[PDB]
Design an enzyme around this catalytic site. Structure first.
Site, short mmCIF file in Angstrom:
data_model
loop_
_atom_site.label_atom_id
_atom_site.label_comp_id
_atom_site.label_asym_id
_atom_site.label_seq_id
_atom_site.Cartn_x
_atom_site.Cartn_y
_atom_site.Cartn_z
N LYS B 16 3.56 0.93 -8.09
CA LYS B 16 4.45 1.45 -7.07
C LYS B 16 5.19 0.34 -6.31
CE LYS B 16 1.14 3.68 -5.06
NZ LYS B 16 0.08 3.30 -6.05
N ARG B 92 1.05 12.48 0.59
CA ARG B 92 -0.20 12.33 -0.14
C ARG B 92 -1.10 13.55 0.07
NH1 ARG B 92 -1.99 6.60 -1.84
NH2 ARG B 92 -0.07 5.37 -1.54
N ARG B 127 -4.81 -8.87 -8.78
CA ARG B 127 -3.61 -8.80 -7.98
C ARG B 127 -3.64 -9.77 -6.81
NH1 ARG B 127 -3.33 -3.39 -6.41
NH2 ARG B 127 -4.28 -3.73 -4.35
N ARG B 156 -5.79 -8.35 -0.59
CA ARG B 156 -6.07 -7.32 0.41
C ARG B 156 -7.57 -7.15 0.59
NH1 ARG B 156 -2.49 -2.43 -2.15
NH2 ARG B 156 -0.95 -3.83 -3.17
N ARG B 167 -11.30 5.39 -4.29
CA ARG B 167 -9.88 5.68 -4.06
C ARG B 167 -9.25 6.53 -5.15
NH1 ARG B 167 -8.64 0.19 -3.30
NH2 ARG B 167 -6.56 0.54 -4.22
#
Ligand SMILES: Nc1ncnc2c1ncn2[C@@H]1O[C@H](COP(=O)(O)OP(=O)(O)OP(=O)(O)OP(=O)(O)OP(=O)(O)OC[C@H]2O[C@@H](n3cnc4c(N)ncnc43)[C@H](O)[C@@H]2O)[C@@H](O)[C@H]1O
Ligand SMILES: Nc1ncnc2c1ncn2[C@@H]1O[C@H](COP(=O)(O)OP(=O)(O)OP(=O)(O)OP(=O)(O)OP(=O)(O)OC[C@H]2O[C@@H](n3cnc4c(N)ncnc43)[C@H](O)[C@@H]2O)[C@@H](O)[C@H]1O
Lengths: 220, 220
Positions: B16, B92, B127, B156, B167
């Site tokens: 995204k 969401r 990432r 993060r 998640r």
């Protein structure tokens, strides 16, 4: 002064934060921590935080004006003067060390955690942190107590495998001056062993120091 | 209205944020992002930030009062109304989607990134993020351009391998209601392919939509 005052240091991911919890909980000392204070300011989102963060992202040392007096005022609080202080991650440079000597602030002993560089990497890549408590964890050694704690674990923005090599440089490059400074009351403690195994050593050390100080107190 | 308005969504670590950069840079749209706005408030250290963070640590959805209107006012800014908007990570949930329909805010197309769950884990564990620029990176696929950028990369607090499973639940559990909602202009795009390979598809889609709208404009 007469209350116990300790000072600890070592290479990143050696066990500084981990040991301090044990020492703190037993001896009841005021645990100061240059690392934590820095992160706290960032957490609060102040100008000092967004300034400091930059240096910490590249594995640099945060400039003295932020660190030196941030620590200064924490030592001014009563608890540190009445119960005793336990430094962690300070000093980290000649200037920093010198700042304290000018105020007659000298510890009882300087504990250095000796760990082989070859180990460090895997220690940091599996380190987790429970925000709700502050307890340090590691996915393999000292894993979470099979509670909801596992679902709320996080990690630091600077625990990147490749960051390690960088933070190692800054480390041993500066410790050469530190050892030199009147800190020769250095007690080297081997870190390549069980969390309990290491603590036992640090406990026994502090324990005798209590006897020494207390002996003179009992001048009969 | 007449300026292009897109809406993207998908499972965590699907691409995204990555795709949005390409779309944004070419089409010149106003890129909104529920994820980023949340993190920004946390960065600033407000009461909303320290509230929201809790839910994000357990992989929960942040409550509507924080999200809904935070997004609301971003759409009120001129650039979004003059150039066009590009939603990312919103809505969401049913309630969230509904909030927008009550204000006559409907997109042109709804792009869903379809990625097999089996892939996701390794995408997120590698990432990285350059703070000075905002560019997404990955240690293997799309690595840093061998610049000082490598030394300033971060991660993060919620990119824990085991967090993923959590998640994922919250994700597909809620998307069932979303699809249902008048969003049936869904264009499913396969995500298991090159970053360039995927973009080409999204470009061609937007490109034709421009022709459609422009055709009526040229009512001859
Ligand atoms: N004075 C100052 N001046 C300027 N800038 C300053 C400053 N002080 C700080 N900064 C800056 O702030 C940044 C962050 O510094 P800081 O946050 O202080 O980090 P650090 O010094 O690199 O050390 P760590 O906290 O990573 O390690 P630790 O040794 O305490 O490890 P722990 O016990 O958790 O353990 C690590 C892992 O090992 C585990 N573990 C512990 N003992 C054992 C064992 N014996 N066996 C196996 N696992 C073990 C744990 O479970 C965990 O997984 C720096 O980059 C610098 O920029
Ligand atoms: N509306 C809302 N309501 C309530 N709460 C809300 C909310 N919106 C957000 N929140 C909350 O905020 C939290 C965080 O949400 P948020 O930050 O929005 O996270 P997310 O939705 O889980 O997604 P990510 O940003 O992790 O993934 P991405 O798909 O954008 O991936 P990227 O392109 O970077 O790519 C990931 C990796 O893959 C890479 N990559 C991209 N494409 C490819 C490819 N084709 N091949 C290989 N590598 C690729 C990248 O390099 C990177 O390494 C949530 O937990 C939730 O609590």
């Amino acid at each position: 002064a007469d209350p116990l005052k300790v000072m600890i240091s070592g290479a990143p991911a050696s066990g500084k934060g981990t040991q301090c919890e044990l020492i703190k909980t037993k001896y009841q000392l005021a645990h100061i921590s240059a690392g934590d204070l820095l992160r706290a300011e960032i957490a609060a989102g102040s100008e000092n935080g967004k300034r400091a963060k930059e240096f910490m992202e590249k594995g640099q040392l945060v400039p003295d004006e932020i660190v030196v007096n941030m620590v200064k005022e924490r030592l001014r609080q009563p608890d540190a003067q009445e119960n005793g202080w336990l430094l962690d991650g300070y000093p980290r440079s000649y200037s920093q060390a010198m700042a304290l000597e000018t105020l007659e602030i000298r510890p009882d002993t300087f504990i250095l955690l000796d760990v082989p560089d070859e180990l460090l990497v895997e220690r940091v890549v599996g380190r987790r942190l429970d925000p709700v408590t502050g307890k340090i964890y590691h996915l393999k050694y000292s894993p979470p107590e099979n509670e909801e704690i596992a679902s709320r674990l996080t990690q630091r923005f600077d625990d990147t495998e490749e960051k390690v090599k960088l933070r190692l440089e800054t480390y041993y490059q500066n410790i050469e001056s530190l050892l030199s400074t009147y800190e020769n009351i250095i007690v080297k403690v081997q870190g390549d062993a069980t969390v309990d195994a290491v603590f036992a050593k640090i406990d026994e050390l502090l324990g005798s120091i209590l006897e020494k100080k207390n002996e003179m107190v009992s001048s009969t």
